[PDB]
Design a protein around this nucleic acid. Structure first.
Ligand code: MG
Length: 316
DNA sequence: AGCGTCCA
DNA sequence: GGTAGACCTGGACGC
DNA sequence: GTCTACC
């Protein structure tokens, strides 16, 4: 289909949001394992699905430039202010990252050193359903493979949106699409491994046992502790996946995911060891202590600080 | 050379 | 609870 | 990273 746009080539189709590079680096956020659905289809231009539509995003020094492909057989035009609000909300631009970076660096000199090189790593505010099933796919897995699993899952079960060049975009599947008793076998053919059952069983649990889609809004409005505990009822969701969802979709900035990276970071970069367990290796008790350690260190937005160090550790 | 272990 | 080990997949890469 | 089984 039509080409992926670049800002310099189609300026009439773009609009900007005030956004200095100190507040956001697309290249350090979009491919770093928060969302798995963005691709750099042209140099410095990132395309993906945002609020049921395909967008391309690119940055200049002080502005985030956006273009939207509506795909309702309407004439091409720049994004409207209402449409740009969805982009603003997705990047949570109301939160000033420079002041968080100064706070985290002031309490943690290691953070300060890493942060000098990794500016503008902020937290996306993701759709709860997309975030839930993407991080169910993420456990005991690598970001390259996760990215393919999420792509194939959307191609098979999500609505077709539009085609740009040779790339066909799909929306994220609904709960209902993932809940059928045939879905697990299909997801296994798509290479999801043992997480195929987790995806289908979790879609069924939400629909059949938790009151449907409104449950995620309930958890958004609940405390961190309540939301984190509730998510763990889902097959494939343990304390880490629940923290990922809390932090990245349920507005819990203190949630600190603890994966292989953060465990290695704690040991290597902080010389940390658990003090509430004589055995020091990863365990339910020591993983929970490590999350508390990072909250005690970094404060109420510790999960956002985690995202800076996680993004940096992917490139080392 | 490419199997087979390591690892995310 | 605490502990141990199995587990789908496929790129990295030692031997 | 989460699940299951055993202590
Ligand atoms: Mg669970």
């Amino acid at each position: 289909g039509p080409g992926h746009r670049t800002l310099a080539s189609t300026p009439a189709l773009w609009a900007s949001i005030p956004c200095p590079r100190s507040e956001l680096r697309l290249d350090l956020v979009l491919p770093s394992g928060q969302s798995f659905r963005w691709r750099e289809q042209s140099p410095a231009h990132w395309s993906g699905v945002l609020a049921d539509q395909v967008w391309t995003l690119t940055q200049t020094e002080e502005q985030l430039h956006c273009t939207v492909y509506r795909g309702d057989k309407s004439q091409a035009s720049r994004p409207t202010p209402d449409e740009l609000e969805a982009v603003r909300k997705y990047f949570q631009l109301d939160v000033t990252l420079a002041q968080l970076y100064h706070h985290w660096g002031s309490v943690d000199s290691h953070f300060q050193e890493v942060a000098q090189k990794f500016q503008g790593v902020r937290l996306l505010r993701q759709d709860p359903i997309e975030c839930l099933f993407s991080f169910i796919c993420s456990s005991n897995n690598n970001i390259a493979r996760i990215t393919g699993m999420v792509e194939r899952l959307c191609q098979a079960f999500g609505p077709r949106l539009i085609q740009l060049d040779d790339v066909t975009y799909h929306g994220f599947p609904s709960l209902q699409a993932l809940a059928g008793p045939e879905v697990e076998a299909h997801l296994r053919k798509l290479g999801l491994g043992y997480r195929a059952r987790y995806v289908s069983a979790s879609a069924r649990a939400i629909l059949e046992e938790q009151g449907g889609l409104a449950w995620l809004q309930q958890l958004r409005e609940s405390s961190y502790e309540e939301a984190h505990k509730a998510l763990c009822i889902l097959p494939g969701v343990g304390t880490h996946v629940a923290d990922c969802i809390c932090l990245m979709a349920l507005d819990k900035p203190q949630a600190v995911p603890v994966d292989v990276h953060m465990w290695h970071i704690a040991q290597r970069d902080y010389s940390w060891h658990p003090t509430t367990s004589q055995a020091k290796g990863p365990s339910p008790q020591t993983n929970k202590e490590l999350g508390n350690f990072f909250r005690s260190l970094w404060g109420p937005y510790a999960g956002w600080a985690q995202a800076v160090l996680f993004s940096a550790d992917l490139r080392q």
